[PDB]
Design an enzyme around this catalytic site. Structure first.
Site, PDB file in Angstrom:
ATOM      1  N   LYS A 102     -32.799   5.479  -5.203  1.00 52.53           N
ATOM      2  CA  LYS A 102     -33.342   5.001  -6.255  1.00 52.53           C
ATOM      3  C   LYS A 102     -32.673   5.486  -7.717  1.00 52.53           C
ATOM      4  CE  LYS A 102     -35.365   2.409  -7.257  1.00 52.53           C
ATOM      5  NZ  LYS A 102     -35.445   1.126  -7.625  1.00 52.53           N
ATOM      6  N   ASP A 142     -33.334  -4.332  -9.622  1.00 55.43           N
ATOM      7  CA  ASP A 142     -34.624  -3.929  -9.416  1.00 55.43           C
ATOM      8  C   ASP A 142     -35.272  -4.489 -10.837  1.00 55.43           C
ATOM      9  OD1 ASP A 142     -36.770  -3.716  -7.932  1.00 55.43           O
ATOM     10  OD2 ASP A 142     -36.507  -1.452  -7.441  1.00 55.43           O
TER      11      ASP A 142
HETATM   12  N1  LIG Z   1     -34.514  -4.262  -2.612  1.00 51.96           N
HETATM   13  C1  LIG Z   1     -33.458  -4.367  -3.157  1.00 51.96           C
HETATM   14  O1  LIG Z   1     -32.579  -3.365  -2.866  1.00 51.96           O
HETATM   15  C2  LIG Z   1     -33.015  -5.587  -3.890  1.00 51.96           C
HETATM   16  C3  LIG Z   1     -31.934  -5.868  -4.387  1.00 51.96           C
HETATM   17  C4  LIG Z   1     -31.749  -6.942  -4.958  1.00 51.96           C
HETATM   18  C5  LIG Z   1     -32.747  -7.728  -5.617  1.00 51.96           C
HETATM   19  N2  LIG Z   1     -33.958  -7.331  -5.196  1.00 51.96           N
HETATM   20  C6  LIG Z   1     -34.924  -8.302  -5.728  1.00 51.96           C
HETATM   21  O2  LIG Z   1     -34.619  -9.543  -6.146  1.00 51.96           O
HETATM   22  C7  LIG Z   1     -34.973  -9.554  -7.614  1.00 51.96           C
HETATM   23  C8  LIG Z   1     -33.955  -9.525  -8.568  1.00 51.96           C
HETATM   24  O3  LIG Z   1     -34.039  -9.577  -9.858  1.00 51.96           O
HETATM   25  P1  LIG Z   1     -34.043 -10.838 -10.737  1.00 51.96           P
HETATM   26  O4  LIG Z   1     -32.898 -10.436 -11.770  1.00 51.96           O
HETATM   27  O5  LIG Z   1     -33.689 -12.302  -9.908  1.00 51.96           O
HETATM   28  O6  LIG Z   1     -35.337 -10.946 -11.551  1.00 51.96           O
HETATM   29  P2  LIG Z   1     -35.830 -12.248 -12.451  1.00 51.96           P
HETATM   30  O7  LIG Z   1     -37.093 -12.494 -12.212  1.00 51.96           O
HETATM   31  O8  LIG Z   1     -34.387 -13.146 -12.328  1.00 51.96           O
HETATM   32  O9  LIG Z   1     -35.693 -11.678 -13.981  1.00 51.96           O
HETATM   33  C9  LIG Z   1     -34.694 -11.913 -14.885  1.00 51.96           C
HETATM   34  C10 LIG Z   1     -35.294 -11.422 -16.487  1.00 51.96           C
HETATM   35  O10 LIG Z   1     -34.118 -11.551 -17.150  1.00 51.96           O
HETATM   36  C11 LIG Z   1     -34.550 -12.385 -18.416  1.00 51.96           C
HETATM   37  N3  LIG Z   1     -33.996 -13.612 -18.383  1.00 51.96           N
HETATM   38  C12 LIG Z   1     -33.887 -14.442 -17.770  1.00 51.96           C
HETATM   39  N4  LIG Z   1     -33.079 -15.456 -18.333  1.00 51.96           N
HETATM   40  C13 LIG Z   1     -32.640 -15.133 -19.502  1.00 51.96           C
HETATM   41  C14 LIG Z   1     -31.734 -15.677 -20.758  1.00 51.96           C
HETATM   42  N5  LIG Z   1     -31.119 -16.926 -20.450  1.00 51.96           N
HETATM   43  N6  LIG Z   1     -31.708 -14.905 -21.608  1.00 51.96           N
HETATM   44  C15 LIG Z   1     -32.250 -13.806 -21.909  1.00 51.96           C
HETATM   45  N7  LIG Z   1     -33.019 -13.123 -20.948  1.00 51.96           N
HETATM   46  C16 LIG Z   1     -33.327 -13.755 -19.835  1.00 51.96           C
HETATM   47  C17 LIG Z   1     -36.176 -12.897 -17.895  1.00 51.96           C
HETATM   48  O11 LIG Z   1     -37.101 -12.088 -19.154  1.00 51.96           O
HETATM   49  P3  LIG Z   1     -36.788 -12.848 -20.598  1.00 51.96           P
HETATM   50  O12 LIG Z   1     -36.780 -14.286 -20.459  1.00 51.96           O
HETATM   51  O13 LIG Z   1     -38.213 -12.280 -21.254  1.00 51.96           O
HETATM   52  O14 LIG Z   1     -35.520 -12.193 -21.268  1.00 51.96           O
HETATM   53  C18 LIG Z   1     -36.519 -12.061 -16.807  1.00 51.96           C
HETATM   54  O15 LIG Z   1     -37.511 -10.998 -16.776  1.00 51.96           O
HETATM   55  C19 LIG Z   1     -35.818  -8.385  -7.737  1.00 51.96           C
HETATM   56  O16 LIG Z   1     -37.139  -8.630  -8.436  1.00 51.96           O
HETATM   57  C20 LIG Z   1     -35.910  -7.444  -6.604  1.00 51.96           C
HETATM   58  O17 LIG Z   1     -37.253  -7.488  -6.087  1.00 51.96           O
HETATM   59  C21 LIG Z   1     -34.298  -6.306  -4.232  1.00 51.96           C
END
Ligand SMILES: NC(=O)c1ccc[n+]([C@@H]2O[C@H](COP(=O)([O-])OP(=O)(O)OC[C@H]3O[C@@H](n4cnc5c(N)ncnc54)[C@H](OP(=O)(O)O)[C@@H]3O)[C@@H](O)[C@H]2O)c1
Length: 416
Positions: A102, A142
């Protein structure tokens, strides 16, 4: 503190159901390595601000540690240690050559800019280089860490390493342009779908046109519902977000639900569906139940009223242990949350394999490999849960801890 001791208590509750050594239990309780770092960055105003970064590798007996990076102001070393101890068993249950890790930074990324985010990621890598690596410790996306940050950190790591090895493999969740992996976006949900189909097969029920209730409508929930409907023949009848929920026995279109939520900020008053709450959602007569939102949705207060045949804990921690016992004595088959959400970990392992091998799989090949891994993980959990007459979570814990015990005994770490 609180979360680390909670993880230790869960480990002991697992160990009392298996023939583990006392020395091995103590060794498992203590994480192998903890790195505290003062991560310095130059703020946009020209001042220098230092944050506190934590990198906890709980165990690497089964292989290089695999763990996410979290950027949340409330982070303490206890939360990082407990989470690392936890995806140690996450990578263990699905048979990966991985340990648990982590990463964290005590930071408020809400007011950090793009330049500040890049600097913070780069500086965190500069701080924790000596303890990480493709064969040693693989960070993963994460909460509040998006693949853009991981592109940045991979850039920094390949800069420091002088590109002597497979830099792409140091971390996972990288953008598709630079060492990314297909299926990363719909990973956890699709793995949950494979587990749902396997659970239906094990239970003896067929999924042709059955009913699934999905609580929580983040990206994971929408993908779970969409994939369930598209593949399993699921006729989803009710979906809820934090604000509210809807119900429609005629079936739902997850694409329409997503469009409505994007247009109106919530799924409230979706056309053709009655507006209901989450507590209404939980007790509905469905065949599959999948909680994908805030942890501990199912409580002891609302456990005996659940009518669903199968519960798929897509979200983490969604059911309290006594509620789990209630659902077990009700004839309800469950799925442990960390066993269920293993799709993201499995696809991150796939991305690492693709990076190490230098060969990048198609979405097809990734899908079949995830299918195989997910099916074998679920079947191992269910078979131990049948042989030992123990709960889903207990069975998954037994599988994971038995694997880690075998890894240590083979490595010679514990002579007993
Ligand atoms: N267990 C593991 O090891 C593992 C590994 C990989 C993934 N995962 C899971 O998969 C998920 C991967 O995360 P994710 O990135 O897919 O979460 P997400 O829900 O895509 O979060 C993306 C963040 O970036 C910001 N964002 C999005 N588009 C934007 C833009 N055009 N400009 C500026 N900011 C922007 C957003 O907030 P704003 O729009 O306010 O900026 C948002 O909070 C995680 O939630 C995790 O649980 C788990």
């Amino acid at each position: 503190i609180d979360p680390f001791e909670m993880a230790v208590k869960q480990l002991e509750r697992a160990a009392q159901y298996m023939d583990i050594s006392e020395e091995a239990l103590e060794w498992l309780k203590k994480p192998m390595r903890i790195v505290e770092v003062s991560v310095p960055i130059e703020m946009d105003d020209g001042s220098v601000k230092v944050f506190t970064g934590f990198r906890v590798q709980h165990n690497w007996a089964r292989g290089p540690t695999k763990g996410g990076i979290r950027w949340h102001p409330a982070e303490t070393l206890s939360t990082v240690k407990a989470l690392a101890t936890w995806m140690t068993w996450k990578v263990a249950v699905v048979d990966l050559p991985y340990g648990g890790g982590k990463g964290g930074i005590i930071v408020n990324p809400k007011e950090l800019s793009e330049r500040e985010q890049e600097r913070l990621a780069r500086a965190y890598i500069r701080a924790v280089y000596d303890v990480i690596g493709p064969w040693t410790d693989i960070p993963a996306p994460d909460v509040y860490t998006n693949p853009k940050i991981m592109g940045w950190m991979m850039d920094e790591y390949e800069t420091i390493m002088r590109r002597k090895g497979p830099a792409f493999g140091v971390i996972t969740g990288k953008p598709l342009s630079i060492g990314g992996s297909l299926g990363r976006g719909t990973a956890t949900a699709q793995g949950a779908i494979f587990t749902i189909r396997e659970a239906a097969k094990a239970l003896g029920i067929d999924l042709k046109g059955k009913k699934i209730a999905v609580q929580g409508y983040g990206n994971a929930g929408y993908y779970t519902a969409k994939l369930a409907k598209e593949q399993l023949g699921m006729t989803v009848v009710a979906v809820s977000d934090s604000r509210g929920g809807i119900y429609n026995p005629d079936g739902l279109d997850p694409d329409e639900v997503l469009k409505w939520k994007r247009e109106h900020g919530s799924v409230k008053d979706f056309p053709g569906a009655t507006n209901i709450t989450n507590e209404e959602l939980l007790e509905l007569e469905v065949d599959v139940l999948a909680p994908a939102a805030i942890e501990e949705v199912i409580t002891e207060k609302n456990a005996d009223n659940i009518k669903a045949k199968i519960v798929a804990e897509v979200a983490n921690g969604p059911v309290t242990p006594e509620a789990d016992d209630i659902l077990r004595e009700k004839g309800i088959l469950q799925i442990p949350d960390f066993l269920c959400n293993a799709g993201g970990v499995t696809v991150s392992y796939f991305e690492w394999v693709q990076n190490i091998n230098g060969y990048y799989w198609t979405e097809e090949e990734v899908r079949e490999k995830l299918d195989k891994k997910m099916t074998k993980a679920f079947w191992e959990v269910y078979n131990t849960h049948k042989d030992k007459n123990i709960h889903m979570r207990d069975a998954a814990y037994v599988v994971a801890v038995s694997r880690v015990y075998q890894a240590m005994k083979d490595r010679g770490w514990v002579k007993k």
